[PDB]
Amino acid sequence: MDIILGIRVQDSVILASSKAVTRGISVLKDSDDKTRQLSPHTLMSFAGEAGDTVQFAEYIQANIQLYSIREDYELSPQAVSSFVRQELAKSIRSRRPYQVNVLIGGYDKKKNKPELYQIDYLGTKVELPYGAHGYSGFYTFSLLDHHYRPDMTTEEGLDLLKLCVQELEKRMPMDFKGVIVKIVDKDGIRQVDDF
Amino acid sequence: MDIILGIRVQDSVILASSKAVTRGISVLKDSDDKTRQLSPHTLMSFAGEAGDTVQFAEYIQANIQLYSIREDYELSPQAVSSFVRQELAKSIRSRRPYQVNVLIGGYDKKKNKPELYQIDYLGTKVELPYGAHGYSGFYTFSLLDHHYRPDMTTEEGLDLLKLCVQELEKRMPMDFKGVIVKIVDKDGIRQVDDF
Amino acid sequence: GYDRALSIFSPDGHIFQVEYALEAVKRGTCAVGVKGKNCVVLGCERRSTLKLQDTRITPSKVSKIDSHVVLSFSGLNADSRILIEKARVEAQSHRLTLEDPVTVEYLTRYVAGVQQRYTQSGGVR
Amino acid sequence: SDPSSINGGIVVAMTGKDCVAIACDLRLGSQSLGVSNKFEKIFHYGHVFLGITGLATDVTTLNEMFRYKTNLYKLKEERAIEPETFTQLVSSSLYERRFGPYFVGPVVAGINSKSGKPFIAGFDLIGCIDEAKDFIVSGTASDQLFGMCESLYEPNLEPEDLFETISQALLNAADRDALSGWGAVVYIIKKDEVVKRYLKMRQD
Amino acid sequence: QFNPYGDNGGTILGIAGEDFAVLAGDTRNITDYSINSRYEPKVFDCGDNIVMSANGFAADGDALVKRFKNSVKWYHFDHNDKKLSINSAARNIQHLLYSRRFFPYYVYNIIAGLDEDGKGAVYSFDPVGSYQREQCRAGGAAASLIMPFLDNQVNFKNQYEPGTNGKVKKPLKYLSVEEVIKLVRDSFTSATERHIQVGDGLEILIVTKDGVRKEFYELKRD
Amino acid sequence: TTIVGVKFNNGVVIAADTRSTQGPIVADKNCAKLHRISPKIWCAGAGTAADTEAVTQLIGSNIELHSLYTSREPRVVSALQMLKQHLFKYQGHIGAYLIVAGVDPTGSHLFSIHAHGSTDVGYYLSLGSGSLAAMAVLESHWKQDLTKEEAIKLASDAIQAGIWNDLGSGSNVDVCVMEIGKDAEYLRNYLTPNVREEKQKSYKFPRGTTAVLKESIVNICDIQEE
Amino acid sequence: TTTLAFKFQHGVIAAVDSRASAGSYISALRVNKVIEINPYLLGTMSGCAADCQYWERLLAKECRLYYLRNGERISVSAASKLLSNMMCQYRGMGLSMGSMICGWDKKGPGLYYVDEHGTRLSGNMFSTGSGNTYAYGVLDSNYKWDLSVEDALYLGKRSILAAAHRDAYSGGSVNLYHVTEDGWIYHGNHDVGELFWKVKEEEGSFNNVIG
Amino acid sequence: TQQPIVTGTSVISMKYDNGVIIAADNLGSYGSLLRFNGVERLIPVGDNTVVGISGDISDMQHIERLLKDLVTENAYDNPLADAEEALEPSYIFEYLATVMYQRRSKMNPLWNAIIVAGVQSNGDQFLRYVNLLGVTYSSPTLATGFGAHMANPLLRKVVDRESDIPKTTVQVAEEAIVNAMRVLYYRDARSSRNFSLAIIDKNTGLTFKKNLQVENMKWDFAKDIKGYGTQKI
Amino acid sequence: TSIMAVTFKDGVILGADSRTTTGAYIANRVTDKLTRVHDKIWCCRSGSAADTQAIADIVQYHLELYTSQYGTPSTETAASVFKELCYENKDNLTAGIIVAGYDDKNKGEVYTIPLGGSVHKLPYAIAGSGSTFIYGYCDKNFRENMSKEETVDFIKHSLSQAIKWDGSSGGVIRMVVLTAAGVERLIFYPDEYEQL
Amino acid sequence: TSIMAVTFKDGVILGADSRTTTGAYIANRVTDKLTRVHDKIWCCRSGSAADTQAIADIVQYHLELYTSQYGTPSTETAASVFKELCYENKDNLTAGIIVAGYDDKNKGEVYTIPLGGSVHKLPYAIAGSGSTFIYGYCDKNFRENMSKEETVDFIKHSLSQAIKWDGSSGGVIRMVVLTAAGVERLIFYPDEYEQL
Ligand SMILES: [Mg+2]
Ligand SMILES: [Mg+2]
Ligand SMILES: [Mg+2]
Ligand SMILES: [Mg+2]
Ligand SMILES: [Mg+2]
Ligand SMILES: [Mg+2]
């Protein structure tokens, strides 16, 4: 649970997250899905300390689902990201902080725009065209800085994402067992089952 | 420079050594040959602290080559392994020890027998049918304990070695960038260029 | 340590110890070297005053310094072993530090330097 | 981290009637990992037997060292070294490394060729001699061996009875030690014949 | 800095017979290289045909025993004088121990008695509450000296039948109370020879359907 | 360890217990802690056992050579001076704590030496983990002008106090008496108050109980003729 | 310690070793590292035995109360979750627990790994303890979904043996369990010493060991 | 968690045929400074018990007040406070032992080592030890601190086991205690010459002796001791 | 330890207690801390017993060799040898030494050499752990050119108080008198000095 | 700091120096360490100035409230209040206090309360860093039932020596006299006490 990438293209947000889970010197799982659907058009990927990641993610999910039922309305990606940021900013000065970094990929149905938010465990929020956490950006950002356009199609975004993963697979010492890729657009959230 | 395996079959010794070299968070090389030919029928693979490994290996190589010229005679694998062990036992109580673990694969032309010696940086020598250093044995020894016979052909040894590498590639958190495989037999030392 | 200057100049400008060392070479068995177009041959005399000799184990007159260079000699046999050992060590030392084997000229220059050193160092002949 | 328990292993020696016995396990490991099941820890120089537990590199180094010294002893003295003399040599050699010691627990066993008297002795890593009449123990399961030997041992056992006693002392001690086992050897030593027996035991 | 823990030495031993059980322990109490008492009872009759010994840090051992004895008393009050079975006592002790998971009773505990079928029973605990039923268990200082001997002489480990050469094991024949007491005495006599914290005296509590009986034996005082 | 030294009328006596330990385990139940430096100069050692032996042998060796060189019988002050200067040089790293006693042409002497190289003079001394138990006895019963028999009694009683009350001490009492104008008498196992009682059972196994894989003869003889 | 569990055609196998150590000293040759939560649920145990025993027996209390309230057997997913949430309360306190919750419910056979961190993973195969790497090697190379109950039982048994041999802190004996929809079935205690020689002969494996 | 400041050294005691004896010096040390020379560390409770305390003096004074309050509280609504329902040594000890173990369990100990000596209603001797850890034990002889190392060996020569108690008279017991106190004065650097001694006998009751001194000391042999080895003058 | 040296009319007197401790245990209660390095040059030792004995033995050797070549050394010369050892090896020593001696030319002299290896010539000097408690008493009661009997009383009373308050001090009070008449050893027992 | 309290025939006298240091810097050279908690119950303070002031203020409050309800408190009662604060808060305090007072029934009384929070009733008491140097002098020169003038001289001489040797002590010598006659403050300057 170390590698999470995000890229916002023309009409969608794409989140790529590694599949590996390591306990000690052994890789326990190579098919782990490091993501939760917060609402029909909002997806959150996560990475950080063991346990805290899923617990935090599910806690956020429950709160957004509660809001959705109460108001019969889906919160905007911006509203969700602000809620999440506050929870992490709250958490960093707690007795035992939740060591969790997240990417929030959402499609705003009101504005008809994809949106990608990057939030670290301190509650540091930034809206970006593409983002990552940990060391992931060190390997991938030079490629994204070079190739990225805001008018890219979903298919071009996936191709640029493949190049980022290939560079990670070449120069990173750790084996992260590939990535699960999910797309967030006007029609909702779907998983790319061949990557 | 972490993964080195060895297996002694019927008529040869096979050494498999990883290709990766890592500096910091970046993999610098994925084609590094972690081995030195000490004599025509004696090969030594090595793993340990950066720098010390090659320096020690080359120092041993120079000494065996010097002996070969002086006496016009190739030392037995046993004699070479004893020389190497003494150098490491000497080294462990030095001001700054050489942090180097080695496998010595040799074919004894007098006895017409393959021989595999495992020596760690403390000077702990053992003759084995198959061996490894570091954590390599934790993943591979259960397979070797199960499948190994002393009458195996070179081709069967390579197949068992492939299974060991596949298990390493599955359950090890680190990407070691595959292995270079070399065979030591009566005709000398050769490299398996497709593995 | 023994520091006595054994190799010294004489009034006529000769170093007699070096010249007497040449007389030892004159006494030694004949050695010959001939280079062809694509080879070099080293021939050596074996004095037949010594029979009942075991030729398998008796020190051969031609010695490999490396896999590509050889050395033969004339003079004191025991002296030659010291030069051969030093040469062999230097050959491996070169391969280790420079990653190329010695050239024949380099190896010659080294051995010749050792010989020179022993003509103006104290306590040695 | 603790050098005397990285590799593991045990040695035990016992005296009997006109005989001595020395035995050891065959395990060599790297902490939790078992590496070899053929690592014998008993050596002999003429008719004197030496068992060595502890750090494996030092076990091997000391064997080579005492082989060296006993070979020179024989050339000069024109006779094989005796157990009492060898014991002093082991002690001397260990103490010369007082402030940089070999991490070992040696055990000497043998019969004096002139008097015929059985002899055993143990040492700490810096040479202190323990010359016991009954038994000597060494290794990672020395506590276990002390418990077995103290109850199982009785004086003046015949060679073939001594064998059973020392074998059962070793085996059951090793089976309560994670770092010992993987096979075992027992030497039964008489004035002019020595028998070596490999024991069958659990391989975990 | 204040160290709330200490080590009072001592060694205990519990063996389960076919229709009986013994819980033995030396009577020596120590700190460091000094002797506090040559006779300080360590094994107690807790009622309902149950015997108990908490070996290690005496203060925590005395507290645990005191609490369990109290738990027996209240079990009677709360459940119409029902007899507390050995298995129920064992489970209760687990919860007493785990109530201090983050500031444990520094003791290795053993209880002995009879199960509900009348067979001999011994239960062994670690400081934090893990427990399990056993046939033979030595606890405390010289536990490592005694257990290998019991593996050999009680369960006949590594012992095979002559003539077969390792093919047929020595059959696991049941031991009498007199046989067990011999093994107990020899265990402690041997431990006393090689362990400095073991000595002075040995007190054994034997549990049968008839009740609880005591036996005392001298040990070396050096 | 418990060791004592007691002066008397015409000489000096030293004593010691016979237990050697490695932590809480007893390595040897009948250890020899009384060491001979010279025929009439003996010492008892506590602390690191290899150090008390090694340092006593070394000084004993040099004392012997000194005796041969000077054609004189060795003196206790010589052993004392050589020991303390050696121990001081090593700054306490040689963990030898000794009680040195003996007779020589000058008279009878009794000293103690600490690992750092400090020495003391006295009529009665005790060292080791059981020194407090021993000194309690010595302070209770010692007097001036003791006889040989009274001194041996006091010395052994002091060791017994350590044997019974100190866990680091046990087993037997060794004594050595050094009297003026006489041979020193080394009394090994002077007292034996800790013999183990007979076991309840014999643990002699039936022959063939142990499982065997292989047998072989070991060649201990040299290479043979013919 | 070595524990494993895997899902297959006819349920889930659960196999564990039996050793307990206090440093180099083997304190126990026979501890039960499988906890019978109830007739349809199993829990393996690695880490602190006390934490495993206490919290999993407390899980059984919750699983029984669930059945009384709802009149229906609890799922493996819910049971595993109740346990992981208990752990998250003492998050950072120092609990040590690594266990596979094995069972059969409506969705078929189920297997969840749960540890002190609060981690909860669904999967087809898991192994924990100091000897898990050895067990994984045998499992990965021989595991199929198409396994028979007989072969699956042997696989889990053989995988523990592999660890017991190489790992110093694993051994004693092997405990087997087979989990069906009608409940779990115990398949005995198997001494490793006796099993090793037996397997060596029949299988031909462990050639390097002399027997 | 604290550290002891003003401290009291050894308390020694032993059983004899008809009762118990307990003793302790009158010093309150302040590290190596022998600051207070008139400190009473033996505190009687009624006419059947004496509590001897070593270690931290401020904690001793606190315990002293607890015991004083215990006597007051026992007398409340108690017509038999000076008879059948008077405080026993065993009651007093168990109370203290409860307090000591509770305090260590809160990581705020009473930095003491206590010996409760007394005689029970039925005439039985009571002698039990408790310290800052809540550790308790009983023996025919009990001593704290240095007394454990030097006094016990001497007192155990008189009463080595339970069967020696009836054979030991009050004169022999007191003599042994007094000798032990002299030995401690020779050898304990934190001891004083002045001490108190209490005897609780089942026949003659509580005899409390104050202002005792160590006497019959041997020092004359010191005049002959010169140098540290070779010096003759 | 409680040690002192006091000059008076006829010469100088050294004084000391006799207690040596290892923690709270009194390892020796009859120690002789008054050490002879020459006929009429003595010293009082405090600090590491091993260090001060080793130093005193070396000094004795130096002054014995000095005497063989150049005759009787001065007290100043003796103090200089002490200082040279203490100063040059200050990193590896824990020694507090008072040097006292009698010449016929110079009469009684006292030098104190504290931890650092500095030298201080004084009319009288006190040192050791117990000296702290008698700085006030000694300053108030010292006079120059006292008689032998007065000086003995001054030292006896001073060390009596040092012993009274310092746990590290005790036993007997030893004294050495250095005059033209010769060398006199004195000893005073607890029953004598405690009642002062 | 150097402080002392001495009982005499007519009552009790408290004495103190006036130096307060922060390391080697003298933060105040005219400090008043003689503190009033009641009309004829005063105290001498040593240790943390913050702690001893806070304690003394609380005690003054307790005795003021005590007086309103139960009349004039005893010196023992005052010492008990000090002790209660010092003992119960020993982990967070560094206070060495001497309590001195005059009753008509009990006359002059002195109680010392060292670091641990223990209480010790004494004829006289000394405390502070400079007290170490005058244990010997004070023990030798104290007498019971001295006159006012003798007691003033005893305190003046004692603190003079404490000041002489202790760098942490100095300045003026303040004194407070507690008798039936009332409360008298005294002060003695360096030129007076240094020449003693
Ligand atoms: Mg190795
Ligand atoms: Mg084992
Ligand atoms: Mg014992
Ligand atoms: Mg030093
Ligand atoms: Mg194993
Ligand atoms: Mg004193």
Describe this structure in words.
This is part of a larger assembly, with ten protein chains of eight kinds. Chain D is built from four helices and twelve strands, in the order E-E-E-E-E-E-H-H-E-E-E-E-H-H-E-E. In chain D, 65% of the residues are buried. Chain D has a single domain, classed as 4-Layer Sandwich (Glutamine Phosphoribosylpyrophosphate, subunit 1, domain 1), CATH 3.60.20. Chain D is globular, with a radius of gyration of 16 Å. Chain D is of the alpha+beta class and 204 residues long. Helix content of chain F is 29%, strand content 33%. Chain F has four helices and 13 strands. Chain F has a single domain, classed as Glutamine Phosphoribosylpyrophosphate, subunit 1, domain 1, CATH 3.60.20. In chain F, the strands form three sheets. Chain F has a five-stranded antiparallel beta sheet, covered by helices on one side. A five-stranded antiparallel beta sheet of chain F has the order 5-6-7-8-9, covered by helices on one side. A two-stranded antiparallel sheet of chain F has the order 3-4. With 226 residues, chain F is of the alpha+beta class. Chain H contains four helices and 13 strands. In chain H, strand 4 and strand 5 form a beta hairpin. In chain H, helix 3 runs antiparallel to helix 4. Chain H is globular. In chain I, the strands form three sheets. Chain I has a five-stranded antiparallel beta sheet with strand order 10-1-2-11-12. In chain I, strands 5-6-7-8-9 form a five-stranded antiparallel beta sheet, covered by helices on one side. A two-stranded antiparallel ribbon of chain I has the order 3-4. Chain I contains five helices and twelve strands. Chain I is globular. Chain I is of the alpha+beta class and 196 residues long. Chain I has a single domain, classed as Aminohydrolase, N-terminal nucleophile (Ntn) domain (Glutamine Phosphoribosylpyrophosphate, subunit 1, domain 1), CATH 3.60.20.10. In chain I, strand 3 and strand 4 form a beta hairpin. The chains are: A alpha+beta (195), C alpha+beta (125), D alpha+beta (204), E alpha+beta (222), F alpha+beta (226), G alpha+beta (211), H alpha+beta (233), I alpha+beta (196). Chains in contact: A-B, A-G, B-C, B-D, B-G, D-E, D-F, D-G, E-F, E-G, E-H, F-H, F-I, H-I, H-J, I-J. Chains D and F meet through strand 9, helix 3, helix 4 and strand 12 of D and strand 4, helix 1 and strand 13 of F. Bound molecules: magnesium ion (6 copies). Chain G: It catalyses: Cleavage of peptide bonds with very broad specificity. Chain G: Keywords: Cytoplasm, Differentiation, Disease variant, Host-virus interaction, Hydrolase, Immunity, Nucleus, Phosphoprotein, Protease, Proteasome, Threonine protease, Zymogen. Chain G: Belongs to the peptidase T1B family.
